DNA sequence: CACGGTGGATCGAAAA
DNA sequence: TTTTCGATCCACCGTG
DNA sequence: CACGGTGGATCGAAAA
DNA sequence: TTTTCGATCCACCGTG
């Protein structure tokens, strides 16, 4: 007999982001004005939380890192998504399977020059849909939202590709290491897709291309593995590297100095223009600073194409063809094919000195027919907004919410609040934003795309 | 017909420190669970706030600074303290006067090395009691609390003594510039005391002593003007400066180098010990870093007296006699007098080389009889906890609450939330602390003081 | 180094 | 017996 | 520069 | 007529 359910009061704690102290104070002030039934006491919130945890048999918590058993975590999640909204026993007869996207990335812990918090990265899983015979019973209303990035693991390690392959291999041991979920008198098998990637990890792990050659030219998407964004921007800035002589080679001692000084002044002017972070940053002598900035190369098409002096029209065409696929809309096979033909005419004509990179040519002659029979899927990688807000809350949880003790339970409580944000039982009432904020992109997309869609994604 | 009064809902916004967004979200979630009458909508909170403001005829708001008319502010405050708890028309007949303490100080805006927010300082007023014939009708339950530091002015200027005297003079023009308050069919005159001082401003403004001489030795409290703390610690560290030769003079080129290096190593070891901020800090070649640290010289009596190697017993005696006055307890005239005699015996004996400073000797021969007929009052300067939490909220209000616009209304909103924290109508439910936290100080106080007190101040 | 802030462990009592 | 619930207490961490 | 966050101005409608 | 109330919109400011 309480107004707020404890199961709703936990989501109330979520939306407000309160302390324990804040919550007890608010309840008690509601009390002292004669009204009792509104706020449940904190103890029932505690019980709701312990319910939302998986049992501590599977928690691996350290000062440095933490993880969970994928099996038990999936079972917990399907138990919840049972209980919350599935109209119970709408069907029992046909055998059920649960579909999920998964993956991970990280970021550096930017801080003052007087700080051990260096970087973080988080193994992650998101349930997308629950399938039965009559239909997929369950769907996520806002899949790309961070509301369902159930954490699987995280660690306090810099994003060095070695430990990246180590966690890669580990999770690849665990993919088959599941037994189907058994709960609620029901068996439900599982199925995963590894797509929740930042945009550099397939260049880390599938580097076997290395711009070597093009197989058809003489399957591998590139659009579904980092979206091939970084390669195109990297090769066009390599052109911007070679924008003085407009020649393939500069090797022998003829251009190195003025090349270096020209890129220095490009890096300067870009620091003036967009707060583009330093590109001579170490990174092992290779510049890849930001993939979101890589995208921001293409929302200023005319602007940065003037800054680089390349034909704004051509890179505008390519920005169009790039933003035309990941949106996942129906693309006309022959029209986009022959537009790739015309843009290739101009690409190969107006630039002869340098060579085409891997994924560009893979698109040029080869990409269209690949789009014909492709398994193109809007990659389940959480939105850039999602990942950014995730880092935001992570910083804050560690800073304004975490326990201050021997600090192992610190990261425990972090995982706790994360999985609470994950448990689909709580309908997490996110901070308000404009309803759609989905800017229908350039007219060159508007006519090169088709508006007959069983989707309308804002970002994914 | 709402559970929370808007006048209480504003204090509810205070205790929780919420956004507008947070408040509307919490109310609406209370709505969607069938219960309406609990939370008043934000509009009535708006009205409560505009009521709590003084009319904008008197607001002086800038990008840089802001102030109010003392007259109108006092009238607003007495109007509130009328309405809130005065049992109305308990008396009308006898003419009423209102007593208030006032003053100001500031602090630097400590920030990263990548920041215009440099320092702040705030003219301030606090109403203590309202007087009538039968009794002082109104008292403050927790006077030294920051709950009633009604802001009068503040500015974005470094604490340079020039503008300090300028604001000093300004407020001294305004003291007499009041007409008695007229509201509620009642006249009530006013009366102020300038005591809300940091601890350096009377050394700024009443520097006419300059350790020159002692008048009685051949009125001016020193205990009621900065409590004479900084002078005693400064002269004893000057002794610590001269703790190698233990002689008055070192002037000619004989000691300057090793003096400098010795104070360097003292500053080093103190940086290791307490996080004592740098003392060679510019300040115009004069070291006065922190008055709270000046106090913290005396809560480690044996510790820092060992670090300086001075007799821990003597400075322990002086710490006792200092903490024995501002607590305001009844002090036995002859016993404390003759204890000042004995501590003077040992002070003047064990140290002959240097000379006594002003306020020390003023205490020694002279201070006791001055305590006899003194106007000793526990100085109305807000607690160090109060001022610290004030800087804390100021930083946060500017950072997590302020409007982000042309930023004049920024400091407007700052003043707004401050005066809301001030309006005595709202019984501000502060963050919880231990009930008393009043450590009954050293036994040398316990017997040199008397326990027959119509006061028991935790800090003031 | 002392002093505010921290979700969850424990007390312990009362309840229940 | 369980179950609530307020009190505390942690051990660390900023700015002092 | 683009993108989340901000108390108070205005709309505007409905109410009232 | 007034009075509420949700929507928006500000123009700036961090980390990107």
PDB file of N, CA, C and O in Angstrom, chain A residues 403-446:
ATOM      1  N   UNK A 403      31.284   4.444  -3.842  1.00  0.00           N
ATOM      2  CA  UNK A 403      31.824   4.259  -2.509  1.00  0.00           C
ATOM      3  C   UNK A 403      33.292   4.639  -2.461  1.00  0.00           C
ATOM      4  O   UNK A 403      34.051   4.393  -3.397  1.00  0.00           O
ATOM      5  N   UNK A 404      33.669   5.292  -1.376  1.00  0.00           N
ATOM      6  CA  UNK A 404      35.045   5.670  -1.105  1.00  0.00           C
ATOM      7  C   UNK A 404      35.509   4.754   0.017  1.00  0.00           C
ATOM      8  O   UNK A 404      35.294   5.033   1.193  1.00  0.00           O
ATOM      9  N   UNK A 405      36.131   3.650  -0.364  1.00  0.00           N
ATOM     10  CA  UNK A 405      36.700   2.676   0.556  1.00  0.00           C
ATOM     11  C   UNK A 405      37.895   2.056  -0.152  1.00  0.00           C
ATOM     12  O   UNK A 405      38.450   2.641  -1.088  1.00  0.00           O
ATOM     13  N   UNK A 406      38.288   0.865   0.283  1.00  0.00           N
ATOM     14  CA  UNK A 406      39.327   0.098  -0.392  1.00  0.00           C
ATOM     15  C   UNK A 406      39.046  -0.059  -1.880  1.00  0.00           C
ATOM     16  O   UNK A 406      39.865  -0.620  -2.615  1.00  0.00           O
ATOM     17  N   UNK A 407      37.885   0.402  -2.327  1.00  0.00           N
ATOM     18  CA  UNK A 407      37.667   0.808  -3.703  1.00  0.00           C
ATOM     19  C   UNK A 407      37.570  -0.355  -4.662  1.00  0.00           C
ATOM     20  O   UNK A 407      37.584  -0.152  -5.877  1.00  0.00           O
ATOM     21  N   UNK A 408      37.478  -1.572  -4.155  1.00  0.00           N
ATOM     22  CA  UNK A 408      37.105  -2.682  -5.011  1.00  0.00           C
ATOM     23  C   UNK A 408      35.599  -2.693  -5.162  1.00  0.00           C
ATOM     24  O   UNK A 408      35.054  -2.658  -6.278  1.00  0.00           O
ATOM     25  N   UNK A 409      34.915  -2.624  -4.027  1.00  0.00           N
ATOM     26  CA  UNK A 409      33.491  -2.405  -4.077  1.00  0.00           C
ATOM     27  C   UNK A 409      33.166  -1.111  -4.780  1.00  0.00           C
ATOM     28  O   UNK A 409      32.017  -0.914  -5.157  1.00  0.00           O
ATOM     29  N   UNK A 410      34.145  -0.232  -4.979  1.00  0.00           N
ATOM     30  CA  UNK A 410      33.907   0.940  -5.806  1.00  0.00           C
ATOM     31  C   UNK A 410      33.411   0.517  -7.173  1.00  0.00           C
ATOM     32  O   UNK A 410      32.281   0.817  -7.578  1.00  0.00           O
ATOM     33  N   UNK A 411      34.249  -0.212  -7.882  1.00  0.00           N
ATOM     34  CA  UNK A 411      33.895  -0.667  -9.207  1.00  0.00           C
ATOM     35  C   UNK A 411      32.749  -1.656  -9.156  1.00  0.00           C
ATOM     36  O   UNK A 411      31.968  -1.749 -10.109  1.00  0.00           O
ATOM     37  N   UNK A 412      32.595  -2.350  -8.031  1.00  0.00           N
ATOM     38  CA  UNK A 412      31.377  -3.125  -7.808  1.00  0.00           C
ATOM     39  C   UNK A 412      30.119  -2.262  -7.894  1.00  0.00           C
ATOM     40  O   UNK A 412      29.208  -2.554  -8.667  1.00  0.00           O
ATOM     41  N   UNK A 413      30.055  -1.198  -7.102  1.00  0.00           N
ATOM     42  CA  UNK A 413      28.922  -0.278  -7.130  1.00  0.00           C
ATOM     43  C   UNK A 413      28.739   0.353  -8.497  1.00  0.00           C
ATOM     44  O   UNK A 413      27.611   0.608  -8.931  1.00  0.00           O
ATOM     45  N   UNK A 414      29.839   0.610  -9.188  1.00  0.00           N
ATOM     46  CA  UNK A 414      29.759   1.114 -10.555  1.00  0.00           C
ATOM     47  C   UNK A 414      29.014   0.136 -11.446  1.00  0.00           C
ATOM     48  O   UNK A 414      28.032   0.489 -12.109  1.00  0.00           O
ATOM     49  N   UNK A 415      29.485  -1.102 -11.480  1.00  0.00           N
ATOM     50  CA  UNK A 415      28.780  -2.159 -12.189  1.00  0.00           C
ATOM     51  C   UNK A 415      27.328  -2.253 -11.751  1.00  0.00           C
ATOM     52  O   UNK A 415      26.431  -2.466 -12.571  1.00  0.00           O
ATOM     53  N   UNK A 416      27.090  -2.120 -10.456  1.00  0.00           N
ATOM     54  CA  UNK A 416      25.743  -2.168  -9.914  1.00  0.00           C
ATOM     55  C   UNK A 416      24.829  -1.139 -10.556  1.00  0.00           C
ATOM     56  O   UNK A 416      23.817  -1.481 -11.167  1.00  0.00           O
ATOM     57  N   UNK A 417      25.175   0.132 -10.419  1.00  0.00           N
ATOM     58  CA  UNK A 417      24.379   1.186 -11.038  1.00  0.00           C
ATOM     59  C   UNK A 417      24.264   1.020 -12.542  1.00  0.00           C
ATOM     60  O   UNK A 417      23.197   1.253 -13.116  1.00  0.00           O
ATOM     61  N   UNK A 418      25.326   0.570 -13.196  1.00  0.00           N
ATOM     62  CA  UNK A 418      25.217   0.282 -14.618  1.00  0.00           C
ATOM     63  C   UNK A 418      24.142  -0.749 -14.916  1.00  0.00           C
ATOM     64  O   UNK A 418      23.203  -0.483 -15.671  1.00  0.00           O
ATOM     65  N   UNK A 419      24.226  -1.912 -14.285  1.00  0.00           N
ATOM     66  CA  UNK A 419      23.239  -2.949 -14.549  1.00  0.00           C
ATOM     67  C   UNK A 419      21.848  -2.527 -14.114  1.00  0.00           C
ATOM     68  O   UNK A 419      20.851  -2.963 -14.698  1.00  0.00           O
ATOM     69  N   UNK A 420      21.743  -1.636 -13.138  1.00  0.00           N
ATOM     70  CA  UNK A 420      20.432  -1.092 -12.832  1.00  0.00           C
ATOM     71  C   UNK A 420      19.925  -0.279 -14.005  1.00  0.00           C
ATOM     72  O   UNK A 420      18.788  -0.443 -14.453  1.00  0.00           O
ATOM     73  N   UNK A 421      20.780   0.567 -14.556  1.00  0.00           N
ATOM     74  CA  UNK A 421      20.440   1.245 -15.792  1.00  0.00           C
ATOM     75  C   UNK A 421      20.102   0.265 -16.887  1.00  0.00           C
ATOM     76  O   UNK A 421      19.423   0.627 -17.848  1.00  0.00           O
ATOM     77  N   UNK A 422      20.582  -0.957 -16.774  1.00  0.00           N
ATOM     78  CA  UNK A 422      20.317  -1.958 -17.787  1.00  0.00           C
ATOM     79  C   UNK A 422      19.029  -2.742 -17.564  1.00  0.00           C
ATOM     80  O   UNK A 422      18.297  -2.994 -18.527  1.00  0.00           O
ATOM     81  N   UNK A 423      18.726  -3.127 -16.329  1.00  0.00           N
ATOM     82  CA  UNK A 423      17.607  -4.028 -16.079  1.00  0.00           C
ATOM     83  C   UNK A 423      16.324  -3.495 -16.704  1.00  0.00           C
ATOM     84  O   UNK A 423      15.781  -2.484 -16.250  1.00  0.00           O
ATOM     85  N   UNK A 424      15.793  -4.169 -17.725  1.00  0.00           N
ATOM     86  CA  UNK A 424      14.655  -3.616 -18.467  1.00  0.00           C
ATOM     87  C   UNK A 424      13.395  -3.508 -17.644  1.00  0.00           C
ATOM     88  O   UNK A 424      12.434  -2.880 -18.100  1.00  0.00           O
ATOM     89  N   UNK A 425      13.365  -4.107 -16.456  1.00  0.00           N
ATOM     90  CA  UNK A 425      12.238  -3.926 -15.551  1.00  0.00           C
ATOM     91  C   UNK A 425      11.960  -2.454 -15.314  1.00  0.00           C
ATOM     92  O   UNK A 425      10.860  -1.962 -15.578  1.00  0.00           O
ATOM     93  N   UNK A 426      12.963  -1.729 -14.838  1.00  0.00           N
ATOM     94  CA  UNK A 426      12.851  -0.284 -14.744  1.00  0.00           C
ATOM     95  C   UNK A 426      12.771   0.301 -16.142  1.00  0.00           C
ATOM     96  O   UNK A 426      13.702   0.174 -16.942  1.00  0.00           O
ATOM     97  N   UNK A 427      11.655   0.950 -16.439  1.00  0.00           N
ATOM     98  CA  UNK A 427      11.559   1.813 -17.608  1.00  0.00           C
ATOM     99  C   UNK A 427      12.285   3.109 -17.289  1.00  0.00           C
ATOM    100  O   UNK A 427      11.722   4.047 -16.722  1.00  0.00           O
ATOM    101  N   UNK A 428      13.562   3.146 -17.648  1.00  0.00           N
ATOM    102  CA  UNK A 428      14.426   4.280 -17.356  1.00  0.00           C
ATOM    103  C   UNK A 428      13.949   5.521 -18.099  1.00  0.00           C
ATOM    104  O   UNK A 428      13.980   5.556 -19.331  1.00  0.00           O
ATOM    105  N   UNK A 429      13.504   6.543 -17.369  1.00  0.00           N
ATOM    106  CA  UNK A 429      13.020   7.791 -17.969  1.00  0.00           C
ATOM    107  C   UNK A 429      14.208   8.721 -18.199  1.00  0.00           C
ATOM    108  O   UNK A 429      14.548   9.551 -17.354  1.00  0.00           O
ATOM    109  N   UNK A 430      14.845   8.574 -19.369  1.00  0.00           N
ATOM    110  CA  UNK A 430      16.049   9.322 -19.714  1.00  0.00           C
ATOM    111  C   UNK A 430      15.819  10.829 -19.604  1.00  0.00           C
ATOM    112  O   UNK A 430      14.681  11.301 -19.627  1.00  0.00           O
ATOM    113  N   UNK A 431      16.902  11.601 -19.504  1.00  0.00           N
ATOM    114  CA  UNK A 431      16.807  13.049 -19.727  1.00  0.00           C
ATOM    115  C   UNK A 431      16.199  13.399 -21.078  1.00  0.00           C
ATOM    116  O   UNK A 431      16.480  12.773 -22.100  1.00  0.00           O
ATOM    117  N   UNK A 432      15.339  14.413 -21.044  1.00  0.00           N
ATOM    118  CA  UNK A 432      14.622  14.898 -22.214  1.00  0.00           C
ATOM    119  C   UNK A 432      15.555  15.445 -23.285  1.00  0.00           C
ATOM    120  O   UNK A 432      16.549  16.117 -22.998  1.00  0.00           O
ATOM    121  N   UNK A 433      15.217  15.128 -24.531  1.00  0.00           N
ATOM    122  CA  UNK A 433      15.806  15.720 -25.721  1.00  0.00           C
ATOM    123  C   UNK A 433      14.659  16.001 -26.681  1.00  0.00           C
ATOM    124  O   UNK A 433      13.537  15.527 -26.485  1.00  0.00           O
ATOM    125  N   UNK A 434      14.934  16.780 -27.726  1.00  0.00           N
ATOM    126  CA  UNK A 434      13.948  16.936 -28.789  1.00  0.00           C
ATOM    127  C   UNK A 434      13.531  15.587 -29.359  1.00  0.00           C
ATOM    128  O   UNK A 434      14.334  14.657 -29.471  1.00  0.00           O
ATOM    129  N   UNK A 435      12.242  15.500 -29.698  1.00  0.00           N
ATOM    130  CA  UNK A 435      11.598  14.239 -30.048  1.00  0.00           C
ATOM    131  C   UNK A 435      12.403  13.435 -31.060  1.00  0.00           C
ATOM    132  O   UNK A 435      12.878  12.334 -30.764  1.00  0.00           O
ATOM    133  N   UNK A 436      12.589  13.982 -32.259  1.00  0.00           N
ATOM    134  CA  UNK A 436      13.311  13.271 -33.306  1.00  0.00           C
ATOM    135  C   UNK A 436      14.754  13.740 -33.455  1.00  0.00           C
ATOM    136  O   UNK A 436      15.676  12.922 -33.383  1.00  0.00           O
ATOM    137  N   UNK A 437      14.969  15.043 -33.647  1.00  0.00           N
ATOM    138  CA  UNK A 437      16.305  15.590 -33.911  1.00  0.00           C
ATOM    139  C   UNK A 437      16.990  14.860 -35.070  1.00  0.00           C
ATOM    140  O   UNK A 437      18.220  14.788 -35.141  1.00  0.00           O
ATOM    141  N   UNK A 438      16.191  14.319 -35.994  1.00  0.00           N
ATOM    142  CA  UNK A 438      16.684  13.526 -37.121  1.00  0.00           C
ATOM    143  C   UNK A 438      16.682  14.423 -38.358  1.00  0.00           C
ATOM    144  O   UNK A 438      15.691  14.535 -39.080  1.00  0.00           O
ATOM    145  N   UNK A 439      17.814  15.073 -38.599  1.00  0.00           N
ATOM    146  CA  UNK A 439      17.947  15.949 -39.755  1.00  0.00           C
ATOM    147  C   UNK A 439      18.014  15.103 -41.019  1.00  0.00           C
ATOM    148  O   UNK A 439      19.008  14.411 -41.258  1.00  0.00           O
ATOM    149  N   UNK A 440      16.949  15.142 -41.823  1.00  0.00           N
ATOM    150  CA  UNK A 440      16.962  14.465 -43.115  1.00  0.00           C
ATOM    151  C   UNK A 440      18.085  15.018 -43.978  1.00  0.00           C
ATOM    152  O   UNK A 440      18.069  16.186 -44.376  1.00  0.00           O
ATOM    153  N   UNK A 441      19.058  14.168 -44.267  1.00  0.00           N
ATOM    154  CA  UNK A 441      20.325  14.607 -44.817  1.00  0.00           C
ATOM    155  C   UNK A 441      20.174  15.007 -46.284  1.00  0.00           C
ATOM    156  O   UNK A 441      19.111  14.867 -46.895  1.00  0.00           O
ATOM    157  N   UNK A 442      21.282  15.503 -46.841  1.00  0.00           N
ATOM    158  CA  UNK A 442      21.359  16.270 -48.084  1.00  0.00           C
ATOM    159  C   UNK A 442      20.507  15.739 -49.234  1.00  0.00           C
ATOM    160  O   UNK A 442      20.299  14.529 -49.362  1.00  0.00           O
ATOM    161  N   UNK A 443      20.007  16.662 -50.069  1.00  0.00           N
ATOM    162  CA  UNK A 443      19.127  16.309 -51.184  1.00  0.00           C
ATOM    163  C   UNK A 443      19.746  15.251 -52.081  1.00  0.00           C
ATOM    164  O   UNK A 443      19.032  14.448 -52.696  1.00  0.00           O
ATOM    165  N   UNK A 444      21.076  15.229 -52.149  1.00  0.00           N
ATOM    166  CA  UNK A 444      21.789  14.192 -52.882  1.00  0.00           C
ATOM    167  C   UNK A 444      21.573  12.824 -52.257  1.00  0.00           C
ATOM    168  O   UNK A 444      21.705  11.805 -52.937  1.00  0.00           O
ATOM    169  N   UNK A 445      21.263  12.777 -50.967  1.00  0.00           N
ATOM    170  CA  UNK A 445      20.694  11.562 -50.399  1.00  0.00           C
ATOM    171  C   UNK A 445      19.201  11.465 -50.679  1.00  0.00           C
ATOM    172  O   UNK A 445      18.713  10.402 -51.072  1.00  0.00           O
ATOM    173  N   UNK A 446      18.473  12.571 -50.507  1.00  0.00           N
ATOM    174  CA  UNK A 446      17.014  12.563 -50.604  1.00  0.00           C
ATOM    175  C   UNK A 446      16.515  11.974 -51.915  1.00  0.00           C
ATOM    176  O   UNK A 446      15.468  11.315 -51.944  1.00  0.00           O
TER     177      UNK A 446
END
